[PDB]
Design a protein around this ligand. Structure first.
Ligand SMILES: [Cl-]
Ligand SMILES: [Cl-]
Ligand SMILES: [Cl-]
Length: 163
């Protein structure tokens, strides 16, 4: 655990993170995918051996000794708002279990279901709040990675609001 567990946000490629492990915004089939998933595939391709896992779950695969936590959020194109919300909350609880099990002091995490799985909706607040709900009881330093300057500001504001 970190001495004073924190949340931070950075606007950069999660493939360049400075944390002890990474959460992939994975697809259920362990495919290279698009966006964060493709960057993770390019950086840690070894971590996609038997990484396939159901929606609402997380499966960790080691790239050397570096843990890649494959977290499968729902594709809101396919799920109802209600069932999608439940699966998105569940994927983050599974991430918290994995981070805890690994005993890491830090984790790099993207906002699940906010890109091509968003179903064309802004889900920053929905995804971030599920991340907080899962990770608040962990003592890892959490570093949220995003690519948009306005999302960076909104995530930074949400973190600071609670401090
Ligand atoms: Cl970058
Ligand atoms: Cl996504
Ligand atoms: Cl973003």
């Amino acid at each position: 655990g970190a001495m004073a567990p924190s949340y931070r946000v950075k606007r950069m490629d999660i493939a360049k993170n400075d944390e002890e492990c990474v959460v992939n915004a994975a697809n259920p089939r362990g495919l290279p995918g698009d966006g964060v998933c493709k960057a993770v595939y390019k950086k840690w391709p070894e971590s996609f051996k038997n990484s396939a896992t159901p929606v609402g779950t997380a499966k960790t695969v080691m790239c050397g000794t570096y843990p890649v936590i494959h977290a499968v959020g729902p594709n809101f194109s396919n799920y109802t708002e209600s069932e999608g919300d439940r699966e998105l909350a569940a994927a983050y609880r599974e991430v918290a279990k994995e981070v805890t099990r690994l005993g890491v002091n830090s984790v790099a995490i993207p906002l699940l279901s906010t890109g091509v799985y968003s179903g064309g909706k802004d889900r920053l607040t929905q995804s971030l709040n599920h991340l907080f709900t899962a990770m608040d009881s962990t003592d890892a330093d959490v570093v949220i990675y995003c690519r948009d300057k306005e999302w960076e500001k909104k995530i930074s504001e949400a973190i600071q609001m609670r401090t």
